[PDB]
Design a protein around this ligand. Structure first.
Ligand SMILES: O=C(Cc1ccccc1)Nc1nnc([C@H]2CCC[C@H](c3nnc(NC(=O)Cc4ccccc4)s3)C2)s1
Ligand SMILES: O=C(Cc1ccccc1)Nc1nnc([C@H]2CCC[C@H](c3nnc(NC(=O)Cc4ccccc4)s3)C2)s1
Lengths: 308, 308, 308, 308
């Protein structure tokens, strides 16, 4: 452990939060109205160390949708229940516009085509209502029963306007990427629902902290995810987590992270802490402008980089 | 005109038909059962000169589906009713796996994504029943009322299994390639129906002959297609007509042609004649093995190449 | 023949020349100084029918370099001496940034990598001085001994600055695209020299006219090129001749043409005439802005399109 | 530190070495004779912890060429002398056939085009003899003066046959990727020389160990590389180090590594140890078959993965 005094670390979290606050650039997502509603000035950072110690600053109790931040989490669930070898019969492990790599598999679980296929592996045979409860049970344990809600509003707007996800769905059905007997449209329904699950910075930072803690929820001690599943999820967050910025993020920050279109950035410092940054304004790559800035400052200050 | 005596030309058509007959290679399409039914040994060649003179050899009265051979024809209809400039707001004009070129348009009207968009331009506002009748009225005039039927069997099997066409449909809806207010699924329905229209070599060769005759049906004299529409259709048949073989076909044969998965090859010798070759066995590119062979022999014998 | 009275056709050539003259757009090539010297306002059009009848307007006696306009011509020479089958062991026949197609061959003889390989097939074993004389002997016959000169200035500037052509040369040597025992650097030298041969609109239009005349020089009657070689050259000019505009040129104009960076456009109306348009200002695609305009107007006026 | 007793760790190194030894697959590189000479059965593993403790098994004193294993090392030198910001004006930082990414920069310092450009940044103005001495001085310090030799044989064979590297060189000169005033051919000469530097497993493992030790040579204590330079080098080894296997190596092994065509694998366990595995037989990706196997077994046994 490299935190010595947790109290003066939060003092530095605060100053970093404040530096990020001045970065007004970006553009709140507006392709469904449930994302355009949100205020550019919303900005919250929540820490949960592997100890269970906590600290928030700013808008950490306002709920927003995980969106793509749920991709690592359901990937972790699928590996937990099924193991590396099974899951990656169906999805790549590399960061390579296009839907399918050279082997007719989605490139990785962090791109839509990947997460769609990952969704079709969780808890098969059962209908969508118990599928969603099963994953929800899992998400709660990762957050130690803190806020995990649901936005029916974005679910309907994402289903009704996600023609690209439907194109993905049919293409994957064509090139035979699902387990046989998969209702593809039902799987998309599940996908949209998972994308519409809601968290706060405070509850998400606890989810990231169980990933930071080999699968053990730091505020309940409970074993949630297998060590295998956490190792996999972190590797792919390290390399595929930030859209087309995953490359420069691995180089300059080098921590497992996964951003979403609601402006969350699920950040993991392994064996140290979990975090969730949130500011709805996104840069041209699709990442929280305040989050990106903050993540740079955090590493250039406390030397948290993978190789420091 | 370079046919002198039509009687001894048919004698040479016969010998060519016979040479092609010995080419047993290929593999009948079998992705729906309505195509696997068909007999490898079926082989027919039908000529209809710009005079109206006719000649068939072999299985020229057995009906088969146009499939992709309908792509030039509905493209011709759309240009006829709407002109070059309107149509190619929506679809490319070049032979460039991928659905959309660099300008987010289907590459050309001879690839599925192109023909789907072309379908969405014909006779808009009207419902699908009158759309289909309108195109059917048109197809009859191009064939001088000879056989134009319909295979409800392949329509249902093509709709129920064409997940790639649905993926295309949703992607084009995402990247906004349809005229606004287009029911995309209804357009796919129309697309599948047009692909399921049936002809015989004898009726198709008459369709190709109106294309060979600046839009005038050689056996009714009636003006069917505008000169613009015929010129466009022939250019794109010359360059995009034979799947991934269009390149080598333009080089070595250099005549407007359009093949389909039922093993038809709709061939046009401009200001000379129309033809329809048919043999259900396809080569690795998707073209009638006997048709390809025959088309080579026809040009290397009567010097019909574009530049001879 | 569709020219009736040659005298009133030239009257229409004149009016078209005049319409093109008002199109001041473009940008004279300036990557070597031997091209930046040239005056934007230079504009000449030279016709030579298959009869031998001639007509020029404007700057038709000012010499400029063929540059890429020599690509069809040396391709014609190679097929003449070696036949389709041999030549296309080494170079593609299709219009597919990249140097080599999927079969590790240059896409076609009209892209640099293609023309470089074509150059390595002409008159092998002999040294470069007799190679150049042999091709020069050939170029003279195609022009009926009219102006064929040489710009030593551009040869040296093209050799000294053509690092992309050298990169091409080494890559083709790596992927083994030359006949064995080929001095690759010597072949580039030959390539640069051929690109630096000089013509006038008046002499070039005679070269294009032998291509328009199945290989027979219309003003000497002499057989210059085999019918095979002319047919091949014209097909590839039809489809690969205008850089990234070859597609839209085949659709909208549909005549064999080949442009070069000096602003020439070598145009062929088969069995009718040869032409050479020249205006050093190029559009963003690399084609003579006045030439492109003129070529459109010529077809939309005298209905010379391939399929009209 | 997670090694407790170094003595029983070497006992496990031995058993792993022995397991790898049974893997006879692969194919010794044979594109120059200086690589075909080598014996398939050569197999050595050398460890050098951050303590300075050492252990070898097998052919650890037989010299071989670094080849691409020198790419991280000269990248480290360039960042050391010039800093992140300068170096990556000229070369990418991501793992994206093709020479240049979308910004006309080599994708990363671990692909030839990258390492060539990196070579052109080291110690500019000086001639090649002092350039090579400067890098050699540096390589010695990283190895604590242990074996660093030179194979003039492979230098000449690599220069005389490396047409692909020359094609790279000219293309980079065309797209202006070098600092101005760079003699490109001289830079290739330098590149070939650096690729021909020789090490043994025992001396290389010491080089990897200074990378494992924030830039401090564990057996001389001397500061060799800046912390910046080591952090960068390790990130790019983690993601770009194993040719087209870097992806699956990051997922399944997750340690900075860099392989070469002589069958070396320069392995780094950060803050633990350096290693050099060597077995000339390569798999289809270009990696030491025994090394790949060994690297898997090492992580699945001592839980050395980045995220374990
Ligand atoms: O974006 C553009 C713009 C553009 C134009 C020109 C060049 C590049 C890009 N134009 C596209 N239009 N439609 C596309 C995809 C959409 C998803 C579904 C389809 C596919 N998705 N993935 C695929 N993968 C493979 O086939 C395997 C493979 C491909 C490439 C290299 C190696 C292996 S096909 C087509 S992209
Ligand atoms: O322009 C760019 C920028 C860029 C951005 C985005 C996407 C592509 C490209 N970057 C380049 N980097 N290098 C280039 C030259 C020099 C090295 C060799 C390159 C090639 N020459 N021939 C090739 N063909 C094949 O490998 C086989 C094949 C692959 C895929 C499809 C069909 C055939 S690749 C061309 S351009």
């Amino acid at each position: 452990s490299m935190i010595p005094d947790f109290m003066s670390f939060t003092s530095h979290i605060d100053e970093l939060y404040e530096s990020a606050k001045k970065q007004s650039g970006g553009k709140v997502a507006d392709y469904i109205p449930q994302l355009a509603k949100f205020s550019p000035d919303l900005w919250g950072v929540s820490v949960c160390t592997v100890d269970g110690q906590r600290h928030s600053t700013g808008d950490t109790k306002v709920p927003f949708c995980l969106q793509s931040c749920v991709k690592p989490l359901k990937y972790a669930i699928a590996v937990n229940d099924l193991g590396t070898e099974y899951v990656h019969r169906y999805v790549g492990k590399e960061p390579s516009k296009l839907f399918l790599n050279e082997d007719d598999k989605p490139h990785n679980p962090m791109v839509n085509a990947g997460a769609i296929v990952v969704t079709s592996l969780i808890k098969q045979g059962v209908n969508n209502a118990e599928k969603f409860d099963y994953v929800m049970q899992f998400l709660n344990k990762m957050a130690g029963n803190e806020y995990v809600g649901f936005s029916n509003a974005t679910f309907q707007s994402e289903r009704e306007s996600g023609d690209r996800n439907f194109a993905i769905g049919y293409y994957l059905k064509e090139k035979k990427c699902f387990p046989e007997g998969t209702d593809m449209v039902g799987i998309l329904d599940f996908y949209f629902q998972l994308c519409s699950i809601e968290v706060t910075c405070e509850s998400a930072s606890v989810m990231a902290a169980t990933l930071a803690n080999g699968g053990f929820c730091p505020i309940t001690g409970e074993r949630v995810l297998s060590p295998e599943a956490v190792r996999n999820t972190l590797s792919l967050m390290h390399s595929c987590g930030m859209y087309d910025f995953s490359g420069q993020f691995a180089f300059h920050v080098g921590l497992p992270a996964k951003s979403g279109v609601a402006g969350g950035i699920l950040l993991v410092v392994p064996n140290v802490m979990g975090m969730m940054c949130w500011s709805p304004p996104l840069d041209k790559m699709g990442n929280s402008v305040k989050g990106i800035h903050f993540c740079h400052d955090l590493v250039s200050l406390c030397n948290f980089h993978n190789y420091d």
